[PDB]
Design a binder for this molecule. Structure first.
Ligand SMILES: N#Cc1c(N)cccc1-c1cn(CCC(=O)O)c2ccccc12
Ligand SMILES: N#Cc1c(N)cccc1-c1cn(CCC(=O)O)c2ccccc12
Ligand SMILES: N#Cc1c(N)cccc1-c1cn(CCC(=O)O)c2ccccc12
Ligand SMILES: N#Cc1c(N)cccc1-c1cn(CCC(=O)O)c2ccccc12
Ligand SMILES: N#Cc1c(N)cccc1-c1cn(CCC(=O)O)c2ccccc12
Ligand SMILES: N#Cc1c(N)cccc1-c1cn(CCC(=O)O)c2ccccc12
Lengths: 157, 157, 155, 157, 155, 157
């Protein structure tokens, strides 16, 4: 039984995220996408909206499921019988930040972290920049799943 | 079912390598350590020596095996019915270099790459620096497995 | 007719910015400095524009405008499709590469970068204001005009 | 004669900080740990608490003392007749940021800065990440000196 | 009359290089690609020049020359004082920043950088030759012309 | 008795190096510049020529001396009763490389390493790029001490 948790805000999920989901699900028996609820910074979409968008985008991934996440990530992972985190990286600076989190998580709970490199096409894509561009009328449709873009237009009106 | 190839020169294997082997073996059903040889440049250790040093320090990992090869890594991977590479990284610069290799490998063969962050204790450990230090009589005993240190001193004398 | 937009907050413009303006102006027929209305800084947009105008008088082919909304819209609505910006660090490059690739994707607008002059490697609007606030001498890092205005803003 | 100031928020002091204090004290005749306070943003610990935690874990360093301050660091340094700052770095990004600060400080006041590389064991340790992990109940006991860990748990409760 | 020199070994030219050539040509009146005679590669300087010429036919304001000696001399002896180059990584930026600052110091020649297209982030002449040598398909990373020539060089 | 060894090829010494020498000598009781002899890569200047150029450039630094260095650096340091290395850094990548060497040197011998950031004016200066530029007729006179530039012109004819 191999498996990993894929944590993030996914506010909203982008094609960069989806590519990582697919690639994780291709190699692990089970993937759990954890949608992290931050009571301090409530973004654009509610946690349930985010989960709904990820489920529509990952309909063809039967070994991937989506749940809301709260509290300490390594607790979330271990309570579900798993011992691994998986995440995508775009830049060296991403790696620096995530290496520090990864080493902390392994230190405090023995949970390991696996990274994959971004697909070239999505190296500049992020939820925050996509939202910003869309807010000022820019076309981010090629960067988001179809379901997401429609929902995004709805929020902006 | 799940499986990954862990590639390198391993000339010689270090504790940093072994940590990554152990962590990969804990997460994939099988791991193949691929000792990749350039047939036109010998290292310090012969291929048989490299493999023996790895085997002697991985005896407790039942789902790990060690094989040598040359040429395209993605051919080594695919001929074994696998589709994943696993590698450790120490720095953001390592990430930039390995990201380019991973994106090339996925492009030409559809093979994916998973990275793990170095254990903190081994952030400064490399085969090349260990050999250089040992060449001038520095004590690298704590950085190498027992199967390696004295063999190394033997080469140097 | 070649041209480029040089975007930033410029709060206030420093000698580092000015060096980039001069270097852009030397290579493009037309340069527009876009002062980004980002509505919480020290100077008003109009104050920033004036300070830039004062220190770029020797550059005949440069003008200064306030900017709001999508930068790529600002650029294209003025008939251009190049952005020019200075970089100090590889980290700056990473951040700016993402914006550059986004801007090219959504609008076909390209971005050209120049490396900082060695002398201005440590100069930023934020650090200059911070040091000046606690009484440090930043006169050698700002246009003579800007330096007087900064003193006034603090008193 | 020789002396340096080691500046920071130390909110709270970690083992990574203490390692740098010890290493600085071994190389300069005197070291002053400067607890720098922003009078408009409180941290987790009061200045007196911060200083007490540092003192309790530096009792074996006879040439180290601890003082608080605010405003320009170079004024703190020069008013004590010193001309050097000493700081630890974990990453190349830390270096880029601290290089800009060091060059500014030498420009405005002629004060120089000396950097040391983190101990490998503490590469992932920061006050902020330790507080964040502890807030959600993660075990950070091995990352903080005895003078700190339980005081921290006390704040969080 | 604006212009820039785009220097490199181009052994061989890739789609990553070509993208930069096209983007430079769109913003400067004149672009000169300088093929650096570095006298040990795969193609001769003349072969490299021809391959570049073949794939830049649609760019009226671009020409290709061999280059030797100081780049800043090459640039200034042709009446220009700008270099243009592409970057993939922050590490590229660090390396190139040092050359750029050196070149500005010794000769007053400026350097403009552009960010790689996302699609070509992993593309280099060296990696393309290496993969092709061991039998990998790099046809999507090279100009159609160049790709045929590379196959020939290996057989 | 504070002190440090400043190691390098110094082939030839540049104003970037000299700035670091001056700043080290301003803070340590004793500085020893170690001119590293590499039997594999013999550069432009002999070790004795390099030592001579450094001595002329550091004539006003009475607590700095210059010696040839061979073999393991931490042995060189410790045999002279010192326990510290000092070096200058220009970029984050410099820091990455040197952090690894620094951690190795502290691991194998307990010798510490202190870094300073380059002066802004010399951030692009290196011996190798200076030699290359000068070789093809470029003016590197503002980047080198006077004595060095004269000697450099001599070698190029
Ligand atoms: N966007 C994006 C992206 C991309 N374009 C390419 C590669 C990875 C990602 C990625 C970013 N994050 C963090 C953002 C968040 O937490 O919502 C992830 C979290 C988990 C898995 C993947 C990602
Ligand atoms: N040494 C080291 C090391 C470390 N200390 C920490 C983290 C990863 C590694 C590591 C380096 N390589 C390069 C190949 C080679 O060295 O021969 C790997 C290949 C596979 C798995 C791990 C590593
Ligand atoms: N300060 C500084 C600086 C420097 N010292 C050297 C090189 C470039 C710059 C630079 C920074 N920014 C962003 C800050 C802002 O948005 O105002 C620029 C925006 C446009 C052009 C140049 C810069
Ligand atoms: N934590 C940590 C740490 C570490 N684990 C390793 C290396 C240096 C440090 C370190 C961070 N800071 C920032 C200031 C602060 O945190 O309050 C310093 C200030 C002075 C000396 C050392 C450090
Ligand atoms: N390959 C590649 C590439 C890419 N895929 C994306 C962006 C830039 C480049 C690029 C690399 N170099 C240096 C290699 C050489 O000297 O031949 C350039 C020189 C000039 C212009 C562009 C490049
Ligand atoms: N050149 C240069 C330089 C600069 N411009 C600014 C800051 C530091 C240096 C510097 C480089 N190295 C390594 C090169 C060598 O070993 O010869 C040093 C070794 C010791 C002390 C300083 C340096």
């Amino acid at each position: 039984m191999t498996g990993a948790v894929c944590p993030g805000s996914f506010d909203p999920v982008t094609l960069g995220h989806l590519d990582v989901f697919e690639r994780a699900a291709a190699q692990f028996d089970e993937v759990i996408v954890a949608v992290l609820i931050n009571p301090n910074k409530a973004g654009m979409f509610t946690v349930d909206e985010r989960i709904e968008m990820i489920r529509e985008s990952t309909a063809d991934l039967p070994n991937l499921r989506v749940e809301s996440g709260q509290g300490l990530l390594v607790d979330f992972v271990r309570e579900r019988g798993l011992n691994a985190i998986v995440k995508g990286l775009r830049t060296g600076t991403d790696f620096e930040y995530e290496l520090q989190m990864a080493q902390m998580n392994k230190h405090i709970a023995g949970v390991d972290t696996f990274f994959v490199a971004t697909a070239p096409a999505y190296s500049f894509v992020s939820s925050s920049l996509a939202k910003e561009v869309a807010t000022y009328g820019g076309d981010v449709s090629a960067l988001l799943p179809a379901s997401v873009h429609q929902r995004l237009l709805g929020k902006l009106r």
